[PDB]
Symmetry: C3
């Protein structure tokens, strides 16, 4: 099913009936509207104007389209901000932000909680029972523009409440944070302030708790809306649109309150911002890195407990990256089929028609400002026609699981210890290694059962709780733990047993020292797997175990005991691929050495091949395979689907 993000409030009413008709003719089934309409619904305080929205919904419904209503809390009206200045957030520099863009609100503001409650309840009671409305999207991209973390007075007071609920007594907090250090000791929760503008660095336990708190406030703000929708819009789904490479908000946790997860994919924008090698930045400028959308489809399929949508799909050039190229011919179709291959229930394009005014006037849509269909329209229509004849098999469990953790992202953000240490970079490195072997991946959270997986990869899990340890113990296949795993306690302290902490119940080894190294300083770690120059991060392991890979000084780089492996250094792409390939072979899994721009994803017994270019490549299909779409020779920016 395909959909689109539409803004009836940006166009003359006379255009609505035409737009709705064309959406149906294009083969679309869902249309999202309303997330930025508060100022149009309540232009004057207390005076609601539902007329135009009632009409827009009716117009779309008349064409048989299903409506997805976004609650309008991402952009409060100026009259509301003027009435309650406390709604405006404060940045890390201590400056109050201003109206003019979007997301200008604090998640801790009690006033905004009530205003959100009011408008969402009104929206839910009015449209919650309409057959035309399929569900809702709460707010819009919580946290975008660095808005999860606010440092205003409301947040400072709420943080104290959060801390008291978490620790019970200030004594427990002092012990947890180790406040004897630098005389940080607090006499009460009232003495604790937000961790910013400190002289020297803030306490890591202090900063991590603040990040946990900030994420929790977003979840609380969201929960309020979910409860309203459950009570006044029974039977209608509730989702939220998450972002690419964004970790300030714990999506796994927030999604527990949603029916499914949704996310917004803009491959070209993410890619331009990625620190790719010189050659790749040019090669993938108009296609996106081969794993950028896929990683997130897998992540969000996991965040949604198996169910997810791509609420926003890039259909042409965007406006927000340093460089905004046009997707190459066929890439919109490719990204769409890729989303579907990874399990997306719906792929919705942002947006129907390019706006000729305001901030995003340079953001392309399926149609140009003059309403003429743009390149993305034809590609989307083609997919609609192809999908109509290609009902898809169900998504099966992947052979490999990758354990992702938002808390881990926070810990490494707080304590990198090495300037080049990157949590997302480490996760992506392992992900790409698996993808280049032609393996499908399921991204799961700590504690999720690993039953059924050939093997699992844990890029890094600093805090290992009982639930996670339990899942690892019950794993039927090997589990590879990346560097710094089990290196921190729940309170951001070094475990008494030293890293890898709880994991020592599985692996008899201890990390007695760690090193972060300047770029360029490499040392070969060698063994049966091969020779690998490694750098960036290195750990000294004390263990009776014979390392599988050894550095030139005799120190081990990789260890294994039973089904558990531990990597004591930052992996190179080469090491990641060879190690993962060896684990695959051991597990009886077949692998393929896919060329740089080719990627595969299965759906039942079907296999999808996506070629990110720039030249044609052959799909590694079995002999006699039956092609459902495309051919064995896959042209650039094209794809093939076959019965394997």
């Amino acid at each position: 099913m395909l959909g689109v993000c539409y803004y009836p409030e940006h166009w003359p009413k006379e255009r609505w009936k035409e737009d709705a008709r064309r959406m149906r003719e294009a083969g679309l089934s869902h249309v999202r509207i309303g997330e930025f309409a508060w100022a149009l619904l309540e232009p004057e305080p207390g005076r609601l104007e539902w007329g135009w929205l009632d009409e827009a919904i009716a117009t779309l419904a008349a064409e048989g389209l299903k409506v997805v209503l976004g609650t309008p809390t991402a952009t409060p009206p100026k009259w509301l901000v003027d009435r309650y200045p406390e709604i405006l957030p404060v940045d890390r520099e201590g400056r109050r932000r201003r109206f003019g863009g979007r997301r200008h609100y604090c998640f801790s503001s009690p006033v905004y909680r009530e205003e959100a409650r009011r408008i969402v309840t009104l929206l839910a009671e009015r449209y919650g029972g309409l057959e035309a409305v399929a569900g809702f999207q709460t707010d819009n991209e919580y946290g975008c523009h660095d808005t999860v973390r606010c440092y205003c007075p409301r947040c400072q007071e709420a943080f104290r409440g959060w801390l008291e609920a978490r620790y019970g007594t200030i004594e427990a907090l002092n012990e947890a944070w180790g406040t004897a250090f630098w005389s940080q000791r607090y006499r009460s929760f009232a003495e604790v302030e937000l961790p910013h503008l400190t002289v020297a660095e803030p306490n890591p336990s202090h900063l991590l708790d603040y990040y946990r708190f900030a994420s929790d406030q977003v979840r609380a703000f969201n929960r309020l809306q979910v409860e309203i929708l459950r009570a006044h819009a029974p039977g209608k789904f509730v989702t939220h649109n998450f972002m690419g490479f964004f970790t300030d908000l714990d999506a796994f946790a927030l999604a527990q309150d949603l029916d499914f997860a949704s996310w917004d994919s803009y491959p070209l924008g993410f890619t331009d911002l990625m620190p790719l090698p010189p050659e790749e930045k040019l090669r993938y400028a108009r296609t996106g890195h081969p794993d950028v959308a896929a990683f997130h489809h897998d992540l969000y399929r996991g965040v949604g407990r198996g169910r997810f949508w791509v609420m926003e799909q890039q259909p042409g050039p965007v406006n927000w990256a340093p460089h905004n190229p046009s997707p190459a011919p066929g890439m919109v179709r490719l990204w769409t089929w890729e989303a579907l291959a990874h399990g997306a229930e719906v792929v919705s394009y942002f947006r129907w028609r390019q706006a000729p005014f305001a901030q995003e006037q340079m953001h392309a849509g399926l149609h140009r400002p003059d309403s003429a269909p743009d390149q993305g329209f034809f590609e989307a229509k083609r997919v609609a026609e192809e999908l109509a004849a290609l009902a898809l098999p169900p998504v099966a469990q992947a052979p490999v699981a990758l354990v992702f953790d938002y808390e881990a992202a926070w810990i490494y953000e707080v304590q990198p210890q090495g300037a080049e240490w990157s949590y997302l970079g480490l996760v992506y490195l392992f992900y790409s290694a698996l993808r280049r072997l032609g393996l499908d991946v399921d991204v799961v959270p700590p504690g999720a059962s690993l039953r059924g997986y050939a093997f699992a990869v844990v890029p890094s899990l600093p805090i290992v709780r009982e639930e996670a340890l339990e899942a690892f113990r019950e794993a039927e296949g090997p589990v590879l733990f990346g560097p710094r795993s089990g290196s921190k306690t729940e309170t951001f302290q070094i475990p008494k047993e030293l890293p890898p902490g709880p994991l020592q119940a599985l692996l008899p080894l201890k990390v007695v020292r760690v090193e972060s190294l300047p770029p360029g300083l490499l040392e070969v770690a060698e063994g049966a797997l091969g020779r690998f120059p490694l750098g960036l991060w290195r750990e000294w392991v004390e263990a009776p175990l014979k390392p599988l890979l050894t550095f030139q000084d005799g120190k081990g780089a990789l260890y294994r005991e039973g089904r558990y492996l531990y990597l004591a250094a930052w992996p190179s792409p080469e090491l990641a691929g060879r190690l993962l390939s060896a684990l695959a072979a051991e597990a009886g899994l077949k692998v393929l050495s896919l060329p740089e721009g080719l990627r595969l994803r299965r759906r039942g017994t079907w296999v999808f091949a996506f070629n990110y270019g720039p030249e044609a490549v052959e799909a590694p299909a079995s002999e006699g395979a039956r092609f459902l779409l495309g051919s064995r020779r896959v042209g650039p920016y094209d794809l093939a689907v076959w019965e394997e």
Copy 2:
């Protein structure tokens, strides 16, 4: 005529008579004084001390020198700032600036408007009728140190007044800005705030109007002083000293209130700050890039409706750039003759003697702190001697016009869409291309008649108003429009007809998509003109016209219909030169392939050749030409003048 910037208030009175005598002996005719003397004229509130200034003026006049008085508003006294804290400006970060340097005032402050009125009226009534006074310079470099744009309370309230005057009703503003977007809708002008510290980016229409407003406030502040000088100093000229590569202030607009334009040239400082290729940065470190002063002489000759002065000319190393080399031997003389060749009525050196104290103690003068003549003195004296025997022919209209627009600079500053898009960079690229062909250039504003020009180049003109379109329609020669021309309406919206908007009445083509590309991503555009690898910016053109240059995907890069051409991509220096050369040939204009460091400028039937080094070159003079200065063999940092 040569002049100098002098500060009698920095030296013992006993030195004044000597300085005046030496200025006359050097061959100088004009002396500028007083722009930073408020604290010396009014050391105590309400207590004026004209004594020393009366004497300084009398001393200079006794030597037959003409005095140019600068109004002292660039640097208000500390007692005044202490009395009225509102005078101090507020930066984009929301911080109030402080006294200690210069230009610490807000252009919107009603209090400062009155204080400026008071001191300027006093100055005008006292010296406005003196024969020794030739004219005035208002303030000093409006906008320097990022002072055009202030974000204080006074500016926020004045902006609202400006908006109401511009739009009439808030309804008109909401439509112009497209405030339905992100619920930005305003109920009144009172709800509109300045466009800074917003979450996400501010509305482009909002930011552009703020930039227009800021520039307008400077013009208003200046107009007040001009009116005072017209009323109390009748017959005395009024000018202002503009800066290099500065666009925050619309000089074309402000100069409408001046008798002529003046500007301050510091080639080495501008050059060190320019992103020149590795080789050029070293080659021109002590000479300045060959086109840096020339571009501004042409620009300001246009800003001044044909009349301009170089109020400040670099005579040695300066203090403000990251690197401050000494001008190579002969460069002060070269820059001076170049200014004169481009039409400068007067070239005034900053400054007479290097100050031994304060912020600019490392800024050289014609004399060292110990009063001994410095290298610049001898070079200036030589020019005085040479000019005395070389009365100059009148400046003639150039063969090529380059249309420059300050509003365009603001639009691209607001919406670059590509990190490397640079308005000044694009303008300079075209300018240098013309200069390397040996062609003289007239820089003109939109709407200025193009009658008489062989052809015209419009680097980029986003908003094309009726007056500009009229001028293009009446052009007698071809007009080349650069990328993004006609891409915006007066309210910063995409034209209904799409870019190039109004220009579609001249060229039957539409820009349906634009791309900004990462550095290094190049694609060849080829045709009769040649093969050109292009990047940075690319536009997709929909048109029945056969492109003159085509990319590898078949998309056109250059189009033409009648006398109008449209470039749909960022030009390379190579493309700019070949295209401009072809236009010159078509127009019957002779061109020359000048070597890297040689430049030409005509004055009547005379031709000036300037060699920026590092080695000697031959002047492309006709056979039998009569040399007025120098010889056919032009040494580095030297020049030649001949009757062509």
Copy 3:
């Protein structure tokens, strides 16, 4: 003697007796404690809890260990900061800092002066007479985290008092600063504000006086504590722990109030932050640059009038640099012996045991968090065993003196004039040149007698006072003055005679112009010494003297008259080495061309050779020399000591 920094307040009391025993067994003699214990000594306002500290001291004393007590003013308790918000400092951006880290106090706060007085007096009266207490360390690293300079209201008012004391009258200040410039004239000291947030740059005289003031406030704050310790802890030494590459605080001046100087050495951290060439950054990542610790030992031996301690010595990886490698095997021992060779009376390791909580949990100690001895422990124990059998000869005067000045650092910080001009960089360049010649160095302040030195090097001394000139006149050997020496008067003005100002009484030459050049712009200066491509900084010298080195344009780069030499350009390492070698030969001093990683330091008739690696090298020992430690073949990260 070896010591350690210990934090009994971070560990269970049951561990104290064990720690003390192990410190004795390791061979340690001194233990520093208490500098961050205020919150533990006074958890509740007015309620002191000395119990635990009394016990910790008694426990250490029982093992025969000497205690060094740090006054606890570096980290005031939260209840105190809450009571007096004025204690918190304000940054250059005008923002009030917050509690959470350390050093969150203003040196001008009258309230904090009294609170410091109170707690230090209590500490001194209670422990000042104990036999177990050897001395005190005042506060902890004054200025760390950019805390010397504060811009709060208290500092603005104190600065005015400082100015009135310095100038007497505002008239004198106006003349000294040259306030006629840009109308900066002040009517009274009350009109003077701090030099920050100005529009354009602040007056250099103004900024320099502020920096002098800031340093003076630290000295005043410290003096208060010294007086208390002299009165209540008679016979106990008082020192302070200075930092590497830190110049905001004039250590020479502050140390006048101390019994000896101490400093904190972290070679790997300093080195990672240094702009070393690509190759060296990798080669010395785990060793530190060969001259980084040595330069500071020599500097602080001078700051301490011949006496100094290394209060904190890196024993493993740290937590605060972008990259934190582990010291290579043997480097802790090497750094320790190097400190001793340079005269350190005591080398104290930071810290005894790695903390498992808070900000520095990744900072290694002699023991891991689980109390197991770490690599540094064994290396420290080895040195203790070796030193026990190697009583050291006395430190003798070095053959070469290097004149260092904190005021010079401030002047160049205020007025770099060239982006690459670096005072510490220039000093280090000369230092390394001397070190690579195998010469020992004494770092002395301006005014210190140069009697006995073969020759002296003055990297740069902008202000040359009578005392300094006197010392130069009485020098028995040549004195080399670096560029910009004598270029400023005490009030930051250009001398009437022009640079080198007072030095013209020694050298008949004048600097008539200076140039700062872009990186890469080089020009050869040649003569008998050789050919040297030079850049960065170049001065034009007017003199009757024949230069020893001449540039391609005939301008001199190096001059000499009698025993005084003047370098008119930024030196290359090659020039520094050849010039210094020539001076050594002339003085009858033998030199050696030491390979990159080898360094020598004498102690009496003994010579120490330190090999920073990565490969073995031979110690340049005389034939038949008797080795006290090691052998002629010095392995990497190892050393040798012999009777030369």
